[PDB]
Ligand binder design. Sequence first.
Ligand SMILES: Cc1c(CN2CCC(Nc3ncnc4sc(CC(F)(F)F)cc34)CC2)ccc2c1cc(C#N)n2C[C@H]1CNC(=O)CO1
Length: 468
Amino acid sequence: GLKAAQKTLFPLRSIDDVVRLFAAELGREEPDLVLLSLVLGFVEHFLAVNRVGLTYFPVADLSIIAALYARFTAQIRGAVDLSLYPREGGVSSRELVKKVSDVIWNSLSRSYFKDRAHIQSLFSFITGTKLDSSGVAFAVVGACQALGLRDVHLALSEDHAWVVFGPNGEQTAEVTWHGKGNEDRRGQTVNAGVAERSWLYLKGSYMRCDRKMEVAFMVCAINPSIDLHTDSLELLQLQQKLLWLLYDLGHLERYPMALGNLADLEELEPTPGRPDPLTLYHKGIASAKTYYRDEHIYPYMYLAGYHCRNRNVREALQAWADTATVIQDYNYCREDEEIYKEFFEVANDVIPNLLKEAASLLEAGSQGSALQDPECFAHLLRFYDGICKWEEGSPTPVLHVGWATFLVQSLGRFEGQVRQKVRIVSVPPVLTFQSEKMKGMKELLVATKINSSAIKLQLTAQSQVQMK
Ligand SMILES: Cc1c(CN2CCC(Nc3ncnc4sc(CC(F)(F)F)cc34)CC2)ccc2c1cc(C#N)n2C[C@H]1CNC(=O)CO1
């Protein structure tokens, strides 16, 4: 509007005042995405970007917020003439969606660092003419809502955002860029990406937001970071309280990564009476299994990271094995590089450092060590099996000799008598391999001294050894 009822809580003088505003908007027919994003971006700017003069909370006065809102709606309504795009049946056209995307995109500063923090909100769009990639998609949806286009909604994968719209909400349209050097397909569907079984489009099991989930997205998008080593306590608490509000209203039910975000916040500072982080990570995994065919990677990564921080080697390895069992049914495609990076870092840095400490503690007499548990060895094997199966039939390889050295080292952290106890069973502690690489590695996995050269040959499918 702003409508009179949206104005009565101002000025916002505290975190709890902001929560009351989110609660009022979430109780409305449609929560005002533009209003809420401006408020979050305002508060984040003066709690994380520029804290000069801060005495408690940056008071958000109505005159300030209303002027920003007016700037946004004047820009959108001046630039998008709806009479040029007749709406058949309350649904938007592809040309109208592309026009709004063009308006947002064409407003952005010509050159700036797209990976900077604090450029996610409409506050950054208005005051700095800067948005990150998914911020552009959110802004398109907010502009569409301001124009009355009730059918345009945010669509989210684990590393990209676009919009759905049109009859039955069945159309998709790219509205922003993805990655760096990748060239944008703004205005096109996501059907080629779904058909190629890339992780980026989740085989079609991506999130189709309603307006309440779009509120949850902007709340996840809060960035409490002040710099490398310092977070805003105020912004952490604000994001935590807003996630619990959404949780209680049922709006995180279909949002796995938001549940993992909330679990991370509870780990940092638990709220009395609320579920433990572990309960929340498992709800996030349950959400992915229930609504998204268990095709999401990050619910298991959230869990693994928690167990990693708590040096629970057994449970971290189980969660990473489960991450690999999801990825194995994808094809590794160009533009999936973010998930390749995460698996690379887990295999080649995080697991080695975890097992190195476990080895030292074993030498110091620890009991019940993961390194003496055959089920833990099986989890390590299943992790590599899913990565090898991922690679099968992909248009580009995954493994190379730079993975082989760490595999050999991690295998060797388990004594031969532990590795011997895993029974590897063929279809048609027990483990079945899906990948041909790990099936051929089976015989090598139980020798007292692991044949490092033969392991490397099998993992990289290297044909030959050195001539001389
Ligand atoms: C937990 C976590 C994170 C945190 N992320 C925060 C942002 C979350 N994203 C989103 N969240 C909510 N909504 C959306 S909507 C959307 C699409 C968009 F809209 F943006 F396009 C994205 C997105 C995804 C999770 C990173 C790496 C993690 C883990 C855990 C592990 C392990 N194990 N790892 C790998 C390790 C490897 N090595 C290391 O040293 C340390 O990390």
